[model samples]
Each structure stands twice: as structure tokens, then as C-alpha cells.
Target: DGECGDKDEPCCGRPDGAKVCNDPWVCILTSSRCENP
Candidate 1:
């Protein structure tokens, strides 16, 4: 039970279209780039 692009999750094909990482609060255009970088 989780949401896409929500928290500690992937930002791929998110229904809300949120291009960001929420685990630490950051924006991510590419999923690979959001790998704790």
C-alpha cells in the first residue's frame, strides 16, 4: 500500500504528476538521479 512519487517511492507514472522525491523532500526529473544523490 503506497503511492507513486509520494514517500520513499518511485516517481514514475504518478497520477498526480509530482516530479519529486518525498522521503527527504526533493525534486527529481529522472528516477536514477534521485537515488539518494
Candidate 2:
């Protein structure tokens, strides 16, 4: 599936979940990589 931006959803297909870690943040996920925001 494509990337998801929902706070309650799995981001970059991360099974655990995803969230904005900081203000003025940027969420980036590369192929076979972890998410960073």
C-alpha cells in the first residue's frame, strides 16, 4: 500500500503505528527503511 498520513493508522506501513515526533516535522520513509518524523 501507499504511505498513510493518519495518526491512528500505520505509517509507512509500520505495524506498530506512527506519529509526528516534532513540530515542523517531516515524515520520510525509504524503501526497506524505518520512518522518521
Candidate 3:
């Protein structure tokens, strides 16, 4: 649900420290942002 899509133009280019969200849990990228769950 971001601004971009597809591998050629990903949704914001992985944010920053974005890792593989293999688990069914949320990961915080920063105090104001959170990644996949």
C-alpha cells in the first residue's frame, strides 16, 4: 500500500533496514514507521 509497485519499481525501495518478514509479526523500522507482519 505504498507509492510504488513491481520489482522494477518497488514500493519505496525497501524503506531502509527492511528485512524479509518471514514471520507472522510486525517489525518496527523506526518510531514513526512499521513494516510487514
Candidate 4:
């Protein structure tokens, strides 16, 4: 399914999966933190 996140994956997989954002982690230059952008 299509997702909204720019740097992250498609909604982090499924809601019933890990119950957490399984989106692809990214490196945000603004904050310099590695996580979902």
C-alpha cells in the first residue's frame, strides 16, 4: 500500500504486526537523528 511518509516505508508495515512504526529509518539532517522522517 502507498504511504504518506517521505523517508519512511509504507505505514511501517501493518497495524497488527509490531504495533509500532516499522517504517524505514532515515537520517534527518535537520535533527541529525536516525528515524522515520
Candidate 5:
């Protein structure tokens, strides 16, 4: 269950309900898949 940064491997949800990704990654909508920045 530890996957991220792609369509198939989307990032996990944050505990604080934040919808922001770190540098080098951008937050997508809804499912919030971490995409390239």
C-alpha cells in the first residue's frame, strides 16, 4: 500500500486532510494523484 507519484501509484492521503504536495510533485484533484511539478 506504499506507493505514489503516478497514475497507478497515487499518493496516500494525509492525516490532516491537506491537499498539497511537496516540491517536485503536484496535487491532483479528488483521488489526489501526485503528478510531476
Candidate 6:
């Protein structure tokens, strides 16, 4: 029921071809550098 919660995943709202850490509102402070979910 979750995504980008583990490793690295392109979320959204990126700069050009870039992406965020999680979904639109699924951002979080992960324990990894550039972590997701």
C-alpha cells in the first residue's frame, strides 16, 4: 500500500526530467540519502 518507501523512486514535481522523493503529497524524511516515501 506504499511506494518509494524503500529505496529510491521518482516521486513527482521534479525539475525538468527530475523527480521528488515521493508522490505529490507522499513526501517524507527517510533514513537514506535521497530516500523515498
Best by lDDT: 5
TM-score of 2: 0.25
Alpha-carbon lDDT, every model: 0.50, 0.40, 0.37, 0.41, 0.61, 0.40
Model 3 stretches astray by more than 4 angstroms: 1-18, 31-37
Among all candidates shown, the one with the greatest TM-score: 5
Residue-wise lDDT of candidate 5 within 1-37, one digit each (tens)?
4765544347666688765455577666765677765
Instruction: Kindly list the per-residue Cα lDDT of model 6 for residues 1-37, writing each as its tens digit.
Output: 2443234542454468443553333444453323522
What would the C-alpha RMSD of candidate 2 be, to one decimal place? 10.0
lDDT of 3 at 11: 29
Q: Candidate 4 lDDT, tens digit per residue, 1-37?
A: 3543334333233356432333465545454333664
TM-score of 4: 0.31
Worst 10 residues of 1 by lDDT: 26-35
The full ranking of all candidates by TM-score, starting with the best, is: 5, 4, 1, 2, 6, 3
Better model by lDDT: candidate 1 vs candidate 2: 1
Question: Compared with the true structure, what per-residue lDDT tens digits does model 2 show for residues 1-37?
Answer: 3444443333353356654333333455543332334
lDDT of 5 at 28: 68
Candidate 6 lDDT (Cα, whole model)? 0.40
lDDT of 3 at 4: 39
TM-score of each: 0.26, 0.25, 0.19, 0.31, 0.41, 0.21
Clashes per model (N, Cα, C within 3 A): 0, 0, 0, 1, 0, 0
Tell me how far the alpha carbon of residue 6 in candidate 2 is from the true structure, in angstroms, after superposition.
20
Instruction: Check candidate 2 and list the clashing pairs.
Output: none
lDDT of 1 by residue, 1-37 (tens): 3455454455554578656555664545554233354
TM-score of 5: 0.41
